[PDB]
Amino acid sequence: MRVLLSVCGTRGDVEIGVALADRLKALGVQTRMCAPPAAEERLAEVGVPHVPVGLPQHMMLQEGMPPPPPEEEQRLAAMTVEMQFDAVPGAAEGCAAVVAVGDLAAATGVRSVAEKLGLPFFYSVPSPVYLASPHLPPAYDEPTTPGVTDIRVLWEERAARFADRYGPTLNRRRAEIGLPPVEDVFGYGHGERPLLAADPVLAPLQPDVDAVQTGAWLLSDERPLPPELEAFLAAGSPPVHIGFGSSSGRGIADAAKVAVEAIRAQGRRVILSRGWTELVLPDDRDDCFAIDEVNFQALFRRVAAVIHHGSAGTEHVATRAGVPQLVIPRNTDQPYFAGRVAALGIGVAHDGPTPTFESLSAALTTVLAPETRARAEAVAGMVLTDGAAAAADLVLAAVGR
């Protein structure tokens, strides 16, 4: 038996897919993953066959860049849907089910091919702000009607906008392969019942939502830290780690610079993850260390604190690692996750994406307080629910039926 995983997203979505692939493997089920070209290294690492779909990393926009002209936005919107119909049929060969993660629009195309081939389809989201309800506003991933804060309206408008932008292409491609048109375009990509791949304590499913909370989808990262990093950690006190994952733009470079300054102001060493936009340290003093891709599950248990962007994966990893967290939210579901770190008492939710030496220092002081550490350690034991295992069973149960 083989399951097709389709990911249209960043590092975080790829890792969510990798985690499921790992649980399926343990069950004796093969997997194949359609993912952006940038997933190549990670997929090669875990031995999951990769079917490249989407633009390469060097064609990715960065926070701060001007939006593309409407004609170009429309072209990308159509591409997002059309690349699924072109690539999923081939990738689905010999598969019994299909699990999509990431972009909803891409998901409508994936579900359509699955529907054509008569294969069960599942879609997961990394947080409750991607599930429509009157309780939480949608993820901050697109501009919304100026002045509107009403949760219900934001969702209704988000859905209408989505249907209008992708509906025509979706339904045209569907018709070309004999499928009747989809009327509820926004709902269609979520599948019959979307899976909330997030921890029930860290990110609890809100009421009035028809979804299955499986728990976060993570694998036991066994990768060892690189020798040079293992040495740095030994030759000194527990440093503070800075990392903003798939974030981009000059804002994070500035934030990182301020973070190093503040960390030093508290007499602590620094470890800086370069990220794909290659963030750089202020100087070469031996009190700091820059790193590229590293096992965070391992690293996070050996640091005094972590400063990050608040994306689902990095926060879950930090949360189960029991390390105090300083969250500097920038977009999508990050303000939500930052608020979660605040509510659980495991760190500080910095107020906004642009920290100053003052605000960062105040937050850092709290984050490094013994109370916070004790609290983080405690909470770490409440977020162990194995989502991938729960998800894999749902998938198999569907194939069984």
Partner 1 sequence: XXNXXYX
Ligand X SMILES: Cc1cn([C@H]2C[C@H](O)[C@@H](COP(=O)(O)OP(=O)(O)O)O2)c(=O)[nH]c1=O
Q: Which residues are annotated as a binding site?
A: 10-13, 76, 80, 103, 246, 293-296, 309-314
Note whether 213 binds K ion by CB under 5 A: no
- The residues, any chain, with a CB within 8 Å of residue 171's CB and separated by 6 or more, are 181, 182
- Are 151 and 143 in contact, with CB atoms under 8 Å apart? no
Compare residues 8 and 391 and give the one whose CB is closer to partner 1: 8
The answer to whether 215 touches 387, Cβ cutoff 8 Å, is yes
Q: Which does 145 bind (CB under 5 to 8 A by kind): partner 1, ligand X, ligand BGC, none?
A: none
Residue ranges binding ligand BGC (CB under 6 A) = 9-10, 12-13, 102-103, 126, 141
Q: Which long-range contacts (CB under 8 A, 24 or more apart) does 289-295 make?
A: 289/229, 289/232, 289/239, 291/226, 291/229, 293/41, 294/223, 294/225, 294/226, 294/229, 295/221, 295/222, 295/223, 295/224, 295/225
Interior/surface letters 38-77, b for 16+ CB within 10 angstroms, e for the rest: bbeebbeebebebbebbeeeeebeeeeeeeeeeeeeeeeb
59 binds partner 1 (CB under 8 A): yes
CB 288 within 8 A of CB 349: no
Binding flag, residue 332, K ion (CB under 5 A): yes
Q: Print the binding letters for residues 287-326 with K ion: x by CB under 5 A, - otherwise.
A: ------------------------x---------------
- Residue count, binding to K ion (CB under 5 A): 3
- Considering CB distances under 5 to 8 angstroms, the limit depending on partner class, which of K ion, partner 1, ligand BGC, none binds residue 102? ligand BGC
Taking CB atoms, the residue at the shortest distance from ligand BGC is 9
Residues 340, 344: Cα–Cα separation, whole Å: 6
Q: How far is the CB of 329 from ligand BGC (least distance, A)?
A: 15
Task: Look at the block and give the residue holding tokens 């879609």.
Answer: 123
Q: Identify which of residues 73 and 141 has a Cβ nearer to ligand X in the complex.
A: 141
- In the annotated binding site for beta-D-glucose, the residues are 13, 103
Report in angstroms how near the CB of residue 246 gets to K ion at its nearest: 8
Query: 308: helix, coil or strand?
Result: strand
- Based on the shown chain and the rule CB under 6 A, indicate whether residue 127 belongs to the binding site for ligand X: no
> Counting contacts by CB under 6 A, is residue 317 touching ligand X?
yes
Enumerate residues 2-61 that contact ligand X by CB under 6 A. 10-12, 15
Binding mask 121-150 for partner 1 (x = CB under 8 A): -------------------xxxx-------
Tell whether residue 330 is a contact of ligand X (CB under 6 A).
no
Minimum distance from CB of 300 to K ion (Å)?
18
Tell me which residue has tokens 């997933």.
39
* Site map 76..95 versus partner 1, x via CB under 8 A: xx-xx---------------
Closest CA to 399 of 121, 188, 190, 194: 121
The CA distance from 181 to 168, in Å, is: 9
Residue 237-266 contact track with ligand X, rule CB under 6 A, x = bound? --------xx--------------------
**Chain position carrying tokens 């991607």:** 130
Residues in the chain: 401
Tokens 């100087």 — which residue?
283
Residue type, 40: E
CB 332 within 8 A of CB 140: yes
CA distance 186 to 156: 10
Q: Which residues are annotated as a binding site for dTDP?
A: 10-12, 246, 293-296, 309-314
Nearer of residues 103 and 315 to ligand BGC, judged by Cβ: 103
**CB closer to ligand X out of 171 and 311:** 311
Residue 207: which of K ion, ligand BGC, partner 1, none does it interact with, CB under 5 to 8 A by kind?
none
Alpha helices in 97-150 (DSSP H): 104-116
Residues that bind partner 1 (CB under 8 A): 8, 10, 54-55, 59-63, 67, 73, 76-77, 79-80, 103, 105-106, 140-143, 248, 330-332
- Residues of this chain that interact with ligand X (CB under 6 A) are 10-12, 15, 245-246, 273, 293-296, 311-314, 317
